Amino acid sequence: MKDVTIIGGGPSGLYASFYAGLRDMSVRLIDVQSELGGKMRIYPEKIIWDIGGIAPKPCHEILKDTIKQGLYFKPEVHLNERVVDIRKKAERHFEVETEAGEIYTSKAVIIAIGAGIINPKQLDVKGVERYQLTNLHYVVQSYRRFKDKDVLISGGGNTALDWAHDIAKIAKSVTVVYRKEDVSGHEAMKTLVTDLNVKLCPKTRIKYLVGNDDETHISEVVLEHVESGDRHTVKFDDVIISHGFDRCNTLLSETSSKLDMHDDCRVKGFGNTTTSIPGIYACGDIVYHDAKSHLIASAFSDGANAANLAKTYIQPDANAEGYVSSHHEVFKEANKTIVNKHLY
Amino acid sequence: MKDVTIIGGGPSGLYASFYAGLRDMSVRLIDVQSELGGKMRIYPEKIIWDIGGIAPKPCHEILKDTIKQGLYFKPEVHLNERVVDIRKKAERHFEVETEAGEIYTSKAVIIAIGAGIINPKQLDVKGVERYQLTNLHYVVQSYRRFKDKDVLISGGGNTALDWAHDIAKIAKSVTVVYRKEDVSGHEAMKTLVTDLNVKLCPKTRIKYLVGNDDETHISEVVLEHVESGDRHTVKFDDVIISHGFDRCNTLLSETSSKLDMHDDCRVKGFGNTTTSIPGIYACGDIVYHDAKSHLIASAFSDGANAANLAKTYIQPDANAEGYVSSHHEVFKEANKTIVNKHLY
Ligand SMILES: Cc1cc2nc3c(=O)[nH]c(=O)nc-3n(C[C@H](O)[C@H](O)[C@H](O)COP(=O)(O)OP(=O)(O)OC[C@H]3O[C@@H](n4cnc5c(N)ncnc54)[C@H](O)[C@@H]3O)c2cc1C
Ligand SMILES: Cc1cc2nc3c(=O)[nH]c(=O)nc-3n(C[C@H](O)[C@H](O)[C@H](O)COP(=O)(O)OP(=O)(O)OC[C@H]3O[C@@H](n4cnc5c(N)ncnc54)[C@H](O)[C@@H]3O)c2cc1C
């Protein structure tokens, strides 16, 4: 039986998986998404400054480091699986169940679901689920691909307007279709007005997408004025959508094992990642305790704590904490090529 | 008046300085040592795995990143100054005093002194304080400089024996002088016996150092057998000393402002970096609270918490936490060259 099932592969669950491995626990890691990272996947292009010990660089670069670390001890990773129940059969015997009916057993459970399940708002056009493999975007990880391109952005929110300005620096042109009701960034908009190669189209929506003959890429877009109904069709190289996010977090309200909650979104942590049920621990944005910050740094220290507390739940007389990695024997073989590279 | 005085420039105090700056507070940072880093300076060559988001690399490399981050907002840094007192004149008015009689004022105080003041045990030979600028070592940051060198190591502890084996891989020869009483690493010693270019010298001490004619480097060493008194003089390229550490931590026992303590070494944190005195906060290894780990990751999340709590002490209705760096306006100008490098 697995020592611990970790539900959620954001920064907190990833680090928890790593530290659980450091404490010599077998790990099962589960996430509903097709990729790990959680909310970090929402802002890949943004420069992160406030992670301890890390010089500022794009979030997506930091995410890749965090995943590699999280998966170092080779946990059993279940992607594309939504957890819908947590049951405690007995001490050191838990059941975690997915919406597809899979049931996973463990001696402990770590809940790391953060803000829950989050996806970008899908463009309301049939049927465009194939263009998101190519030139229909819901994130922007870098701007390089847009050099000398004609680019369409849909949305008037801060994110869309910032994207528009930055992409316009190297793109041939940027067109922004939006509703004025969505515009909360007054200064961001004024900047776009002064960008010579940005065309602002208020009261305008994407109505249809025109695919190429291979039907694998967007070739043109049919735009519609929301009052006049006037339509025109314009060629674009890329289409970027920023319509907000769909959020879903039903697990802890529907679960068999009820935990004391801080609010309707957060588990009450008892001074740390300890929950109201022994054997279940909560780390990251999902938990509230007095030492929390809404930071990745806190998600990390939470993950160490959860792994430690799970270990001593499973082994009452195990060491309260993990051995420092610097002198940890589990890394001795792996350290060899690193030293050799760095010290010789 | 400075917003906050941070006592101690280890990982926790460094990150606290950074995050205090993120919260738009003016910072004074003080450390007794000639360089920042605290206990990290003790293990520069060791590979660190358990800092969240950081791929394994030498501690000294990670330290340099941590210092650069810690000093980003250009705090007022006082090196080589030992803090001996903390006084609270009134709310938002603290006095921090050094052993040289300097008195620094602030609206808040963050205590980040970790395990206190630590220095390697100095070789008991007059007068060798000048060779430590050149080839008398108390740390080993990398092995490269010892290639084809004849190297002397004094000490039988785990650190000395590990150093000896690793240096012997590329050094011409390694001689280890030690007392058997100090040997706790049975297997480390057996390895050295099989190292062909390692000479083991139990019951032997460094008696004298013979300088070069410039008197700037060690040229030869006079070794003495601790029983027979037999002496011989051997040429070495480098001398490395591992005799343990001198430790001193009198501040919180001698201070004017008495804090509730966890033990004789640790301040009691009230669920977090909050101490028994409003306006004073403790972060890192110095504090005990229920969410602690003896990790740099916890030192970091502690530092964010201390900065946050100090801010709201100074400004009762300031935001409870800092704005995430990704969207923080203070970084907008600095981000430009970074984006440009990374995103364009
Ligand atoms: C736009 C933005 C900017 C930010 N910038 C910064 C910054 O600069 N610095 C910083 O420190 N923090 C920043 N943050 C906050 C940081 O992203 C979060 O603190 C961190 O992501 C929380 O990590 P987590 O693992 O606890 O939760 P999450 O990141 O939310 O990960 C939760 C994971 O659990 C999965 N999951 C959830 N539920 C279920 C279920 N029922 N079954 C299966 N799987 C499931 C989700 O798919 C998700 O992958 C920012 C946040 C936002 C949104
Ligand atoms: C050999 C070793 C291996 C380790 N390996 C790891 C690892 O792999 N991963 C990990 O996460 N952790 C590791 N640690 C632990 C980590 O080093 C500590 O958790 C961390 O250094 C604590 O940081 P700190 O800022 O709280 O305290 P410290 O590092 O102790 O820094 C305290 C600073 O305050 C200064 N100071 C103190 N007192 C006074 C005074 N009265 N006046 C002025 N200045 C003052 C000191 O000079 C010092 O610079 C290791 C520790 C040791 C010793």
Side-chain angles (χ1 to χ4, degrees):
Chain A
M1 175 175 300
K2 234 75 168 173
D3 288 317
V4 64
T5 294
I6 307 185
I7 308 160
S12 193
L14 286 166
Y15 185 87
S17 297
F18 162 82
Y19 209 80
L22 185 144
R23 304 298 320 263
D24 199 79
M25 285 179 293
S26 59
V27 172
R28 179 183 296 103
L29 179 64
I30 308 167
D31 205 281
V32 62
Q33 299 289 358
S34 63
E35 51 186 31
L36 304 158
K39 284 191 287 188
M40 289 185 78
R41 294 170 298 114
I42 299 178
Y43 53 108
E45 84 279 24
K46 305 299 284 180
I47 314 300
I48 306 186
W49 287 74
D50 49 17
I51 303 184
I54 303 188
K57 68 170 178 179
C59 170
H60 76 259
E61 294 288 355
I62 301 181
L63 176 51
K64 279 182 284 202
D65 296 326
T66 301
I67 295 180
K68 182 162 188 170
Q69 177 183 47
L71 306 185
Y72 173 69
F73 291 109
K74 294 173 162 53
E76 177 188 315
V77 184
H78 293 251
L79 298 174
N80 307 292
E81 299 190 38
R82 176 174 189 171
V83 167
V84 300
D85 198 16
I86 298 169
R87 292 181 301 270
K88 182 176 183 183
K89 192 162 190 26
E91 298 304 325
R92 297 171 189 84
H93 192 156
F94 291 85
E95 295 178 352
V96 175
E97 188 166 336
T98 69
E99 70 175 358
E102 296 303 325
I103 299 177
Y104 305 111
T105 65
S106 64
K107 304 188 172 188
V109 173
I110 296 180
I111 301 171
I113 55 176
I117 303 173
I118 291 162
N119 297 285
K121 224 98 158 186
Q122 196 86 4
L123 172 69
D124 194 354
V125 167
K126 306 151 327 185
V128 300
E129 38 280 317
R130 65 185 182 276
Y131 299 134
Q132 47 192 359
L133 300 161
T134 51
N135 63 345
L136 178 62
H137 317 268
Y138 291 95
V139 286
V140 178
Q141 305 203 10
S142 74
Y143 310 113
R144 301 182 184 94
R145 63 180 307 168
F146 304 119
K147 184 180 71 173
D148 299 335
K149 305 288 189 179
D150 293 319
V151 181
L152 174 65
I153 293 181
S154 181
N158 292 345
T159 298
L161 304 186
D162 283 340
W163 282 348
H165 178 63
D166 292 343
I167 292 173
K169 287 198 176 68
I170 62 174
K172 185 175 193 173
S173 71
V174 182
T175 302
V176 188
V177 296
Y178 65 99
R179 309 294 209 95
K180 189 172 175 297
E181 311 96 78
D182 297 331
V183 177
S184 67
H186 184 63
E187 292 300 322
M189 182 61 74
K190 281 206 282 182
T191 294
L192 290 187
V193 179
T194 73
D195 280 319
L196 298 195
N197 63 336
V198 173
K199 182 177 183 175
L200 296 174
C201 299
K203 295 186 179 178
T204 304
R205 66 160 68 87
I206 293 174
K207 183 55 179 177
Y208 293 111
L209 294 183
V210 176
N212 60 336
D213 312 316
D214 285 18
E215 210 60 32
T216 61
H217 294 73
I218 299 166
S219 179
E220 299 180 278
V221 180
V222 182
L223 301 174
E224 180 183 53
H225 191 285
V226 305
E227 297 179 334
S228 65
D230 293 352
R231 297 169 175 184
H232 64 298
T233 302
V234 183
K235 181 180 297 181
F236 293 104
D237 293 296
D238 296 276
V239 175
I240 309 175
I241 308 297
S242 183
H243 293 177
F245 299 89
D246 294 325
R247 303 157 232 189
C248 178
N249 194 19
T250 59
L251 178 52
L252 296 171
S253 57
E254 295 183 346
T255 181
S256 301
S257 303
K258 301 292 186 291
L259 304 166
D260 292 355
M261 303 293 294
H262 178 69
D263 47 44
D264 42 354
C265 298
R266 285 184 287 174
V267 177
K268 169 188 182 182
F270 287 71
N272 49 34
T273 61
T274 302
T275 75
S276 56
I277 298 176
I280 301 181
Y281 305 89
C283 55
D285 278 4
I286 189 53
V287 70
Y288 172 80
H289 58 70
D290 287 336
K292 283 297 302 176
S293 297
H294 59 56
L295 293 177
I296 293 165
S298 179
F300 286 154
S301 62
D302 269 7
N305 184 246
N308 286 335
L309 288 181
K311 180 75 183 182
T312 60
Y313 171 76
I314 297 175
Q315 302 188 27
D317 289 297
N319 292 330
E321 299 192 34
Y323 206 83
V324 284
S325 65
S326 59
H327 281 73
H328 208 303
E329 57 287 19
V330 78
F331 298 120
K332 188 161 167 19
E333 294 313 307
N335 277 342
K336 298 241 280 299
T337 183
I338 299 176
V339 170
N340 283 321
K341 176 198 191 82
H342 285 267
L343 299 185
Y344 288 98
Chain B
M1 175 175 300
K2 234 75 168 173
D3 288 317
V4 64
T5 294
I6 307 185
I7 308 160
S12 193
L14 286 166
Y15 185 87
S17 297
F18 162 82
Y19 209 80
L22 185 144
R23 304 298 320 263
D24 199 79
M25 285 179 293
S26 59
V27 172
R28 179 183 296 103
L29 179 64
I30 308 167
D31 205 281
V32 62
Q33 299 289 358
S34 63
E35 51 186 31
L36 304 158
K39 284 191 287 188
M40 289 185 78
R41 294 170 298 114
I42 299 178
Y43 53 108
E45 84 279 24
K46 305 299 284 180
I47 314 300
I48 306 186
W49 287 74
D50 49 17
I51 303 184
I54 303 188
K57 68 170 178 179
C59 170
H60 76 259
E61 294 288 355
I62 301 181
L63 176 51
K64 279 182 284 202
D65 296 326
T66 301
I67 295 180
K68 182 162 188 170
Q69 177 183 47
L71 306 185
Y72 173 69
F73 291 109
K74 294 173 162 53
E76 177 188 315
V77 184
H78 293 251
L79 298 174
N80 307 292
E81 299 190 38
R82 176 174 189 171
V83 167
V84 300
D85 198 16
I86 298 169
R87 292 181 301 270
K88 182 176 183 183
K89 192 162 190 26
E91 298 304 325
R92 297 171 189 84
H93 192 156
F94 291 85
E95 295 178 352
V96 175
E97 188 166 336
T98 69
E99 70 175 358
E102 296 303 325
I103 299 177
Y104 305 111
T105 65
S106 64
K107 304 188 172 188
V109 173
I110 296 180
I111 301 171
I113 55 176
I117 303 173
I118 291 162
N119 297 285
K121 224 98 158 186
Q122 196 86 4
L123 172 69
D124 194 354
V125 167
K126 306 151 327 185
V128 300
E129 38 280 317
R130 65 185 182 276
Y131 299 134
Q132 47 192 359
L133 300 161
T134 51
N135 63 345
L136 178 62
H137 317 268
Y138 291 95
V139 286
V140 178
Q141 305 203 10
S142 74
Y143 310 113
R144 301 182 184 94
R145 63 180 307 168
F146 304 119
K147 184 180 71 173
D148 299 335
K149 305 288 189 179
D150 293 319
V151 181
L152 174 65
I153 293 181
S154 181
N158 292 345
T159 298
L161 304 186
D162 283 340
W163 282 348
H165 178 63
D166 292 343
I167 292 173
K169 287 198 176 68
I170 62 174
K172 185 175 193 173
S173 71
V174 182
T175 302
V176 188
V177 296
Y178 65 99
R179 309 294 209 95
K180 189 172 175 297
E181 311 96 78
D182 297 331
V183 177
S184 67
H186 184 63
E187 292 300 322
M189 182 61 74
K190 281 206 282 182
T191 294
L192 290 187
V193 179
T194 73
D195 280 319
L196 298 195
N197 63 336
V198 173
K199 182 177 183 175
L200 296 174
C201 299
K203 295 186 179 178
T204 304
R205 66 160 68 87
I206 293 174
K207 183 55 179 177
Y208 293 111
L209 294 183
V210 176
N212 60 336
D213 312 316
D214 285 18
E215 210 60 32
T216 61
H217 294 73
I218 299 166
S219 179
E220 299 180 278
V221 180
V222 182
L223 301 174
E224 180 183 53
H225 191 285
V226 305
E227 297 179 334
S228 65
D230 293 352
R231 297 169 175 184
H232 64 298
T233 302
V234 183
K235 181 180 297 181
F236 293 104
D237 293 296
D238 296 276
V239 175
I240 309 175
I241 308 297
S242 183
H243 293 177
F245 299 89
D246 294 325
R247 303 157 232 189
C248 178
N249 194 19
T250 59
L251 178 52
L252 296 171
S253 57
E254 295 183 346
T255 181
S256 301
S257 303
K258 301 292 186 291
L259 304 166
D260 292 355
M261 303 293 294
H262 178 69
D263 47 44
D264 42 354
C265 298
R266 285 184 287 174
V267 177
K268 169 188 182 182
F270 287 71
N272 49 34
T273 61
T274 302
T275 75
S276 56
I277 298 176
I280 301 181
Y281 305 89
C283 55
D285 278 4
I286 189 53
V287 70
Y288 172 80
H289 58 70
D290 287 336
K292 283 297 302 176
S293 297
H294 59 56
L295 293 177
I296 293 165
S298 179
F300 286 154
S301 62
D302 269 7
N305 184 246
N308 286 335
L309 288 181
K311 180 75 183 182
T312 60
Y313 171 76
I314 297 175
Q315 302 188 27
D317 289 297
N319 292 330
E321 299 192 34
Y323 206 83
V324 284
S325 65
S326 59
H327 281 73
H328 208 303
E329 57 287 19
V330 78
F331 298 120
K332 188 161 167 19
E333 294 313 307
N335 277 342
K336 298 241 280 299
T337 183
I338 299 176
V339 170
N340 283 321
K341 176 198 191 82
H342 285 267
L343 299 185
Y344 288 98

